[PDB]
Amino acid sequence: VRSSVHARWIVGKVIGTKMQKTAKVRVTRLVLDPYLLKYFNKRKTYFAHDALQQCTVGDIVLLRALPVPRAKHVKHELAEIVFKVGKVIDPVTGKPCAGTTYLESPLSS
C-alpha cells in the first residue's frame, strides 16, 4: 500500500559506484538446497539512489524501497550506511574499531 516494489528493506554490500547518484549493491539471501537441505547464498543486484554520492565500494548499506521506481532498474534508495568500509563504528559500544580491535578503548570515555 506504501510501495509497488517487492523488496521493502534490504541490506547489501556496495559493489559499484560508476553511475551518477546510483550505487550498485549486492544482496545475499539464504536459499535452502532442496536435495542437500543446506542453506547457500543467493545473490541479487540492486540499484539504489544515492543523492549525495556518499557510497564507497565495499561498504555495507541499507536500502529502502522507493514509493515507485524512479528508473528501469532503480527501485530503491540508500536509507543509511550500516558499515563504512574501513571506518566501522561498533554499534554495541559506539567506539571506532579496526576489525576485532578497538581503535579507541571503551574505557577511555
Binding site: 521493502r8 528493506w9 534490504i10 541490506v11 544482496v27 545475499t28 539471501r29 539464504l30 555495507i60 541499507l62 529502502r64 536509507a79 550500516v82 558499515f83 566501522v88 561498533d90 554499534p91 554495541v92 559500544t93 574499531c97 576489525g99 576485532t100 580491535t101 578497538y102
Partner: protein, 58 residues
C-alpha cells in the same frame, strides 16, 4: 522465516551482536557476547517472536 533476509558478517567488530530491521524503520540491537546459543534463541523469541497464542490462532 523464509522471507526474512538473514546476512552474516565476520570479524568486523570486537564483539558479536545481532541487529533486526523492522518495516517501520526501527532497529533492534541485541548484544550476544557471553551468551549461549540457547540464550540468544530465547531472547530473540521473547523480544521479536510470535507467542504461542498467535500461532495456535493461525
Amino acid at each position: 522465516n523464509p522471507w526474512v533476509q538473514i546476512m552474516m558478517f565476520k570479524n568486523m567488530t570486537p564483539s558479536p551482536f545481532l541487529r533486526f530491521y523492522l518495516d517501520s524503520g526501527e532497529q533492534v540491537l541485541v548484544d550476544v557476547e557471553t551468551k549461549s546459543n540457547k540464550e540468544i534463541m530465547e531472547h530473540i523469541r521473547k523480544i521479536l517472536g510470535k507467542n504461542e497464542e498467535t500461532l495456535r490462532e493461525e
